[PDB]
């Protein structure tokens, strides 16, 4: 399995994008939590409030999922970061395989 | 070293499981923080509040630690995700080797 | 690209260290968020409040960045953890390459 981390403008879209993704079964689970973003943006170091999301799904889905977020994200260019999981416990991953579209 | 991410029902058990783990010296450090879980559960997309935990220990401990959490987790099937650390600074990891059971 | 996770005593230094890093262009973006630390410290299992940071930059920068944090961190021995990103979307990483010193 893998972890996909992306950030959102506000809770609205995060929940919207995330529930859409679960419905479509692109991911099994999501963990959202706010955080303060400090980043280089066009003419200045900006600081705003964001809603980061931790999506968890199948490695084979990485491609189509990345595609799907591009299409759903409020941001013209989302951060879609994939971090592979080197190991996971025996039940969970069976629960995740079942929960994601085939 | 590696990172082990697991989620809890509430702060009660998170602290209970986490302090138990440190005592037993299964991990050197833990970082807990709440997050909103959106996941596929039996008959519906549920949404609740959770307490995610970031455990940090030795790679050789991964096996026994996974075992230990299964035995301690409130959840009948915990998410026990291992993410290997590709590199870490020189002091910290010595501090972590010392802090974990031999 | 890679992820560098480090923790801070309070928001003061986190923002100070993080903005310094962006200015110097050592990293493109940072996401800070508080968390409760439970860790083995000298004579006891301590529990305090921390400000964890997720720094995102180039893998080639890992070395100099680790060096730089050691020099900037309030902590005599920071946790500087590097987690490589196995994949990232096509725009973002171009935006990150541009945002980091050459």
Phi-psi region of A19 (alpha: psi -120 to 50; beta: other; left: phi over 0): alpha
Residue in chain A nearest C29 by alpha carbon: A39
CA distance B84 to C84: 9
CA distance B59 to B47: 33
State which H helix or E strand residue B91 sits in: none
**Which amino acids of A are annotated as binding site, given as ranges?**
48
Chain C environment of A37 (Cβ under 8 Å): 29-31
Query: Which of C37, C39, C80 lies nearest to residue B88, judging by beta carbons?
Result: C80
CA distance B33 to C36: 6
Q: What share of chain B is helix, strand, coil (3-state, %, to 5)?
A: 35, 40, 25
CA distance A20 to B55: 30
Residues 40-99 of A with CB under 8 A from B: 54, 56, 83, 85-89, 91-92, 95, 99
Q: In sequence order, what are the beta bridge partners of B47?
A: B38
**Quick check: C44 and C65 in contact, CB under 8 A?**
no
Chain B environment of A28 (Cβ under 8 Å): 39-40
User: Cβ contact (<8 Å) for A33 and C30?
Assistant: no
Beta-carbon contacts of residue A5 (< 8 Å; ≥ 6 apart): A52, A53, A54, A55, A79, A81, A83
Phi-psi region of B25 (alpha: psi -120 to 50; beta: other; left: phi over 0): left
Query: Which of B3, B31, B83 lies nearest to residue C35, judging by beta carbons?
Result: B31
**Quick check: C67 and C28 in contact, CB under 8 A?**
no
Beta-carbon contacts of residue C87 (< 8 Å; ≥ 6 apart): A62, A66, A81, A82
Residue B68 to residues A88, B3, B21, C51, Cα–Cα distance (Å): 14, 15, 8, 28
Cβ-in-10-Å burial (0-12, 13-18, 19+) of B55 comes to buried
Geometric angle at alpha carbon A91, from A88 and A94, rounded to 5°: 85
User: Cβ contact (<8 Å) for A3 and B81?
Assistant: yes
State which H helix or E strand residue C8 sits in: strand C2-8
The answer to whether C84 is a known ligand-binding residue is no
CA distance A92 to C79: 29
Beta-carbon contacts of residue B55 (< 8 Å; ≥ 6 apart): B3, B4, B5, B6, B18, B21, B27, B29, B30, B65
Closest CA to C80 of C3, C1, C4: C4
User: Cβ contact (<8 Å) for B89 and C78?
Assistant: yes
Q: Which two tokens stand for residue B2?
A: 């590696």
Chain A environment of C33 (Cβ under 8 Å): 33-36, 52
What resolution, expressed in A, was reported for this entry? Answer: 2.0
Beta-carbon contacts of residue B67 (< 8 Å; ≥ 6 apart): none
A/C interface, count of CB pairs below 8 Å: 72
* B66: containing domain: 2-102
- Coil vs helix vs strand at A78: coil
How many domains is chain C built from?
1
State which H helix or E strand residue A42 sits in: none
User: Cβ contact (<8 Å) for C22 and A40?
Assistant: yes
Tell me the shortest Cα–Cα distance from C83 to chain B, in angstroms.
Answer: 5
The CATH number for A11's domain is 3.30.70.120
E-strand stretches of chain A:
2-8, 29-41, 44-57, 81-84, 87-88
CA distance C92 to B101: 41
Handedness of CA B41, B43, B45, B50 (dihedral sign): negative
Q: Given the structure tokens 């959770």, which residue do they identify?
A: B50
């Amino acid at each position: 399995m893998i972890i996909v981390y992306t950030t959102f403008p506000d809770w609205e879209s995060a929940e919207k994008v995330v529930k859409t993704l679960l419905k479509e079964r692109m991911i099994a689970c999501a963990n959202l939590r706010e955080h303060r973003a400090f980043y280089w943006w066009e003419g200045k170091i900006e600081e705003d409030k964001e809603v980061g999301a931790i999506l968890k799904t199948r490695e084979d889905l990485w491609e189509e999922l990345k595609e799907r977020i591009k299409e759903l994200h409020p941001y013209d260019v989302p951060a879609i970061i994939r971090i592979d999981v080197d190991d996971v416990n025996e039940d969970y991953l069976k629960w995740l395989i079942e929960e994601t579209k085939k």
